[PDB]
Design a protein around this nucleic acid. Sequence first.
DNA 1: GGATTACACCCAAGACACCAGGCACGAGCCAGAAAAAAACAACGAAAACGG
RNA 2: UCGUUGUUUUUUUCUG
Lengths: 84, 49, 48, 48
Amino acid sequence: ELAILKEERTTTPYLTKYERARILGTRALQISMNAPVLVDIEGETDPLQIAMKELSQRKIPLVIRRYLPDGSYEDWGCDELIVD
Amino acid sequence: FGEMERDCMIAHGAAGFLKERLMEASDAFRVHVCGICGLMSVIANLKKN
Amino acid sequence: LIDTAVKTAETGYIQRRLVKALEDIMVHYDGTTRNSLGDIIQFLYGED
Amino acid sequence: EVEQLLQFHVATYMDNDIAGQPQALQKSGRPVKAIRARLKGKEGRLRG
DNA sequence: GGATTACACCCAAGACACCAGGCACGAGCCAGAAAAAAACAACGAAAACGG
RNA sequence: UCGUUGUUUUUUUCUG
Ligand SMILES: [Zn+2]
């Protein structure tokens, strides 16, 4: 009802800056409090650096739920959004 | 954290920062409400749960 | 000096009124520009 | 007179800036702090 | 020309627009700092004094 | 023996 099927998803496919910041904050918070790390780490200790490194690889298990003005919403997986 | 600062923070769209800066770094609080009348008259005794 | 002293306050008041007028307009995903109620102001922000 | 007096204190305790009528005061002479006065103004709750 | 059908019309009654005064509000930037000041009149007890 | 609290109210002269 409220959800929109994957085939007719119309919103912009790119990743808005605000989505970028929210995703980075959430991931860093999760990692920084004993969460699994989906990608290898070489020498970087900061959770937030780890977060951007993970994003750059498109390896984030987060689904953005975009609310349209009416109330209907569509969902995008972070794996499928074109990041600048 | 005057009004104009609130508006500037909105401008950048830093929602969560604004939320916490007005709750956590300031007078936060917790309450209880009744889901029927929607008032704040609940008589809560935590140690008596 | 008097001119600056008077002008600052009135400009500040105008600023406050403007901000408290347009503080809820938000560019929605559809490309429309709607205030809190969902009323549409512009069908495309700046028409571009 | 007594019931009008009671009405007067009730009204003042609810608001102390009624137009065209004198203003309730403390023995200090300072006007009272009615709830409406508390809420309004920059110092009030909303803006304070 | 009295009688007879035909009607002219108008004027007081009543509904309404509105009305310009008056009459109220009611507002009049931001953050920060320091020192300096803040009720009392009368009353009946109750220790007080010389009688 | 952790714990451990410090006024309001106005007015004033100032700072950017
Ligand atoms: Zn209830």
